[PDB]
Ligand binder design. Structure first.
Ligand SMILES: NC(=O)c1ccc[n+]([C@@H]2O[C@H](COP(=O)([O-])OP(=O)(O)OC[C@H]3O[C@@H](n4cnc5c(N)ncnc54)[C@H](O)[C@@H]3O)[C@@H](O)[C@H]2O)c1
Ligand SMILES: NC(=O)c1ccc[n+]([C@@H]2O[C@H](COP(=O)([O-])OP(=O)(O)OC[C@H]3O[C@@H](n4cnc5c(N)ncnc54)[C@H](O)[C@@H]3O)[C@@H](O)[C@H]2O)c1
Ligand SMILES: [Cl-]
Ligand SMILES: [Mg+2]
Ligand SMILES: [Mg+2]
Lengths: 337, 348
């Protein structure tokens, strides 16, 4: 069929999903719901049908799927409601505020036989796909250390991202993208996590963080988000047994430097090269989502992967708060103590 | 004419350079040289320097006031305690000892014999570091709360005895001591916690690099890193404060400072395409929101190490490199090694 999607939450990302979803082959934006009149008015201006309630969205038999782009605390119940009403769900990152909440959603999805997919759009980021190529094709030999940094100097945007109750802060906002990229790329269990949160801005939520992650296969990674950074460190810095790579910024500027376990290095005998062309990740998120609904393809963004990321986020919070190194992503649910 | 006579013990790379360094001081000269190898004793003689046949002979010489110890790390403690007992003041190369307890022993002996022991922490005078010290003290970027200090290169481990655990080899003990000493000299706060990971990417029995994340009791954080397998270098300094950020790229002292203005609060950045999404928060701030400044002139550290050493001997000045500071660094190195070997975060 031509699948019909309703946007639930017509804010900054929700309104951009009209563009994204419409770009897919057999998917259409059918309507919108938002609790704010001004947001509903803006959607009406683009010709979009406005629903009176969320209940009205779910009762509409013409609607095949919903996109949930609300603040982070509402995601879970909205998703569960949708799936219980027979609707497939695309949910904005971070899907839930705890890993146990995703499990519950996955239970519902399995029971009603409807699909739930996290919007992890940044696996398609070109900078990341250049790193993916390098990692897979051994451009700098065995890549054993990765540094992934998103720096800005604008603080925390909007309203709800400042608040703990709405799943605010930068681990949840940007950290989930970079952690999802890391775990998508590296096929290895997490051996250890240490972390520090930034409260430089004096908010009740983190305005940035750093985490040091070691994998079972010996790969180490540093993942960093900052909002108080008036000079930026590079987007990517990666070390391999046969070279080093850098990607400075979103403009994809950078280079590789290679020597002409590791051989004894010398700075006098090196060659500088361009970054390779990005790896392919095909099709787009929304085309893959339609393929998944049609049962023609396996999902690129798997709920099992998303689950591991949430546990990792839970490990990061536990590690920063106790100022300890944690030695698995298991055991941070705090159900029993 | 009241010149202190210094003997160089260990005529290797640094020991031969100490001839030049000690000679530049006002009231101190190089009386001569001892090395355990006859090859190195000949080499010193062929630079017109007096040579001793034994370390015992240096220490028996009434004309000698002080010794400079520039031997591999495992021999520092015995040679220092010997010189002290013989009534000689001591300058010892970094890292002074391989354990913190060893330095406490030397400190005890120096006190008992009423002689001075000083660590050669020469990189406290580094121009790049003194720029950071200027920024830190003058609040150039407001209150500096996070510092990242990195020495990267792709030349591996140099020599020699530095490849071996027995002789206190590896990068923590080589470059780490300089960077950690800089940090602890700058920050007037006790270390609260340390996590660390070592690099063994070259396959040696000692570390070819490390990274550590340090937190102080006053909330200041630091990341210190040395790497010898980095074909691309990250900046020498990257520092963050309540009112700006600074960067020193390299030893050439290139870099800048970027600070917020009072107009940043009422302005809004114009979004860019960042990967698959539009971003406002990670977009450059609007033109009105920031000021870009040159790095300041470096703070003054005066006088030179060796003139300060003489001033300490003449009892006219306190030491710049204090032994208690050197002790806290060695305790930090011990915390780092423990943190990395147990894969834990070490507290105190
Ligand atoms: N994938 C990405 O690159 C990306 C980018 C930006 C935001 N996001 C995610 O998108 C979500 C929303 O982000 P945003 O920046 O658009 O926030 P926003 O504040 O701009 O939009 C949220 C909208 O949801 C509405 N809303 C709140 N509660 C609702 C309810 N229960 N029912 C229906 N509507 C409700 C609000 O009125 C608002 O219009 C968050 O989960 C965020 O993390 C993802
Ligand atoms: N402060 C700095 O910037 C800096 C720079 C380089 C080296 N160093 C330090 O200086 C010391 C020596 O370093 P190097 O690179 O010159 O080493 P090196 O190998 O070049 O020289 C050491 C010399 O000591 C001699 N020696 C060994 N055992 C001896 C003994 N028991 N008695 C007398 N002489 C002995 C050796 O024969 C050799 O000539 C080390 O502690 C190192 O950490 C410091
Ligand atoms: Cl721990
Ligand atoms: Mg996998
Ligand atoms: Mg002090």
């Amino acid at each position: 069929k031509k699948y019909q999607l309703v946007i639930v939450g017509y804010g900054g990302m929700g309104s951009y999903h009209v563009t994204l979803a419409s770009a897919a082959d057999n998917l259409e934006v059918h309507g919108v719901f938002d609790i704010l009149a001004e947001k509903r008015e803006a959607a009406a201006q683009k010709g979009l049908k406005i629903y009176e309630s969320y209940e009205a969205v779910l009762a509409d038999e013409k609607v095949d799927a919903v996109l949930i782009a609300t603040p982070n605390d509402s995601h879970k119940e909205l998703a569960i409601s949708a799936l219980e009403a027979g609707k497939h769900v695309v949910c904005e990152k971070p899907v839930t505020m705890t890993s146990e909440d995703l499990l519950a959603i996955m239970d519902v999805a399995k029971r009603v036989n409807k699909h739930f997919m996290v919007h992890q759009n940044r696996r398609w980021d070109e900078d990341f796909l250049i790193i993916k190529e390098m990692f897979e094709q051994k451009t700098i030999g065995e890549m054993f250390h990765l540094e992934s940094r998103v720096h800005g100097a604008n603080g925390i945007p909007g309203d709800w991202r400042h608040l703990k109750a709405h799943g605010g802060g930068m681990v949840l906002d940007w950290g989930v993208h970079l952690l999802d990229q890391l775990l998508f790329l590296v096929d290895s269990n997490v051996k250890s996590v240490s972390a520090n949160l930034s409260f430089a801005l004096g908010d009740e939520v983190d305005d940035g963080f750093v985490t040091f992650i070691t994998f079972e296969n010996g790969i180490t990674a540093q993942i960093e988000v900052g909002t108080t950074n008036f000079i930026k460190l590079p987007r990517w810095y990666v070390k391999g047994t046969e070279g080093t790579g850098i990607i400075h910024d979103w403009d994809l500027s950078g280079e590789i430097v290679k020597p002409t376990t590791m051989a004894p290095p010398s700075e006098e005998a090196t060659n500088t090269l361009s970054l390779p062309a990005p790896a392919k990740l095909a099709p787009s998120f929304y085309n893959n989502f339609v393929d998944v609904l049609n049962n023609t393809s396996e999902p690129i963004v798997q709920n099992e992967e998303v689950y591991q990321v949430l546990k990792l986020i839970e490990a990061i919070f536990e590690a920063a708060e106790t100022n300890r190194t944690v030695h698995s992503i298991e055991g941070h649910h705090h159900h029993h103590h």
